[PDB]
Every structure is written in C-alpha cells, then in structure tokens.
Amino acid sequence: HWGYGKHNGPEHWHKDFPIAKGERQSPVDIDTHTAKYDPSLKPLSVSYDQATSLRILNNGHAFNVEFDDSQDKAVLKGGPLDGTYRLIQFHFHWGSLDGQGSEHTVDKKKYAAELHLVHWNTKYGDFGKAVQQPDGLAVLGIFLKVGSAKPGLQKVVDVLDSIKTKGKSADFTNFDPRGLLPESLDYWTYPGSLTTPPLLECVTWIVLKEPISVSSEQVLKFRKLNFNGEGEPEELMVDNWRPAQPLKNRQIKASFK
Ligand SMILES: [Zn+2]
Fold this sequence. Notes:
The chain is mainly beta. It has one domain: Carbonic Anhydrase II (Roll). Helix content is 7%, strand content 29%. It has 3 helices and 15 strands. Strands 2, 3, 4, 5, 6, 7, 9, 10, 11, 12, 13, 14 and 15 form a 13-stranded mixed β-sheet that branches. Strands 1-8 form a two-stranded parallel sheet. A hairpin with a 6-residue loop joins strand 6 (75-78) and strand 7 (85-94). The longest helix is centred in the C-terminal third of the chain and has 7 residues, at 216-222. It is globular and about 50 Å long. Bound molecules: zinc ion. Residues 1-256 form the Alpha-carbonic anhydrase domain. Interacts with SLC4A4. Interaction with SLC4A7 regulates SLC4A7 transporter activity. Interacts with SLC26A6 isoform 4 (via C-terminus cytoplasmic domain).
C-alpha cells in the first residue's frame, strides 16, 4: 500500500495508520540549542563482536541487513536503556540528491542518508511482542554525509545489484556492523516511533551526533535500487525518508556537554 511516491507518501499514511498523528511520532528535528545534557544517562554499550549477519533483503521500501537474533549475540545496552536489546536488522533511508535523505534533522539540517540499527528488548521474548510495548525497541540512528568512502559499507554496496527489485534477497553472512559506526558515541535520545507503517510508538531513539562519511559512488549505488518488483516499470528507490514530526510533549536529552 504505502510508500514514498506522490500518491502514497507520508502525508497519506494516517488514513490506514491513524497513530501517524500520535503523541510520540518519529523522526523529529533535534534542536541543539534546546536539547539538554543529562548527567544521569549511563555510558552506552554497543557489543557487536559476536554479530551474525545472514541475509539482505529488498522489501520495496528499503533494504534490510538481517541478523541472527535467536541469542544475545549483538546487543545494545546502557545509555538511556534498562536491560538488553538484541540487534535484528539494519537499514537506511536516503535521498535523490545529497541535500536530503535523513529522517531526523539537526537544527533543520538534512543529511544525505540515515542508518537505523534496530534492536528489540529481550524482556519481551520476540520482536513481535516487543513492538507492542513502549520500551520494546532501541534504534541507533547514524547520519551519513557524502565525502570520503566508508570502507565498512562497501560489502553492502557491492551486493545491491543482486537485490535490485522488491522481494529479492541474497545471502549476506559475516558482515561486521562495527564498520558502520563513527568514532564517537555521543548521542541524543528521546522516546518515539517506528518511522514506517505501522508507526508503533515503541522506540527509544539513540541518535549519534557524529555522522559517518560515505562516497558519492557509494550513495549512487543506493539510488540504483528499485521500489518495484522485477519486470515492472522502474521506480528508483530514492527519497525513502519520512519528514520530521511534531515533538509534542517530549524532551530530547544529550549525552554530552
Ligand atoms: Zn528506518
């Protein structure tokens, strides 16, 4: 149904998913002049040494790099979080041009793309149970700007030809998500939602302050993916981002001074 076209884009989602107009929707604009340092946040802990990637899938909206989440292999803990959150997948949002593509914004600045590492709270047993809880998910968001290449992204870029169209997948084992992280783990955090239907308000967002750089050639390969299925008219997979939503009765907290 839903997508990012003219006729089915974000501004339409509310008809089928009324929480689209909810109290804790994502993404948001992060105003660096109102987010406040919070000395209570605990250090953040990204433990990806035992991550087992399995497959990469074009779902018609983005591509997901999927992990084995049936044990505590790759987990996020610390920061704002209580307990342990297991990595299930990562995906990106990106633009048709370098001046747009991110979902979150920083002082209204749009980055070229945004990476989402999605993790679910083990206290709820499965992903599908977790998304029904306000503290069910933790999403680590990382901005991408265009400049030098990101070596740890190339293995992703190089498999994209094999998943050009909706419904295609490829084996994608032994990929190390640590190669997608910036140097610093300074972050902003707030409570919000999934940014695609069903838009559930189940996410603790953790948005890193430092972007990673990718090359123009890397991003150009993202933009050659298709929203459509095999043999259908080509619709390039670009501009698969939701714009900023109202902050409402939320505060964005900073991990850093
Ligand atoms: Zn996302």
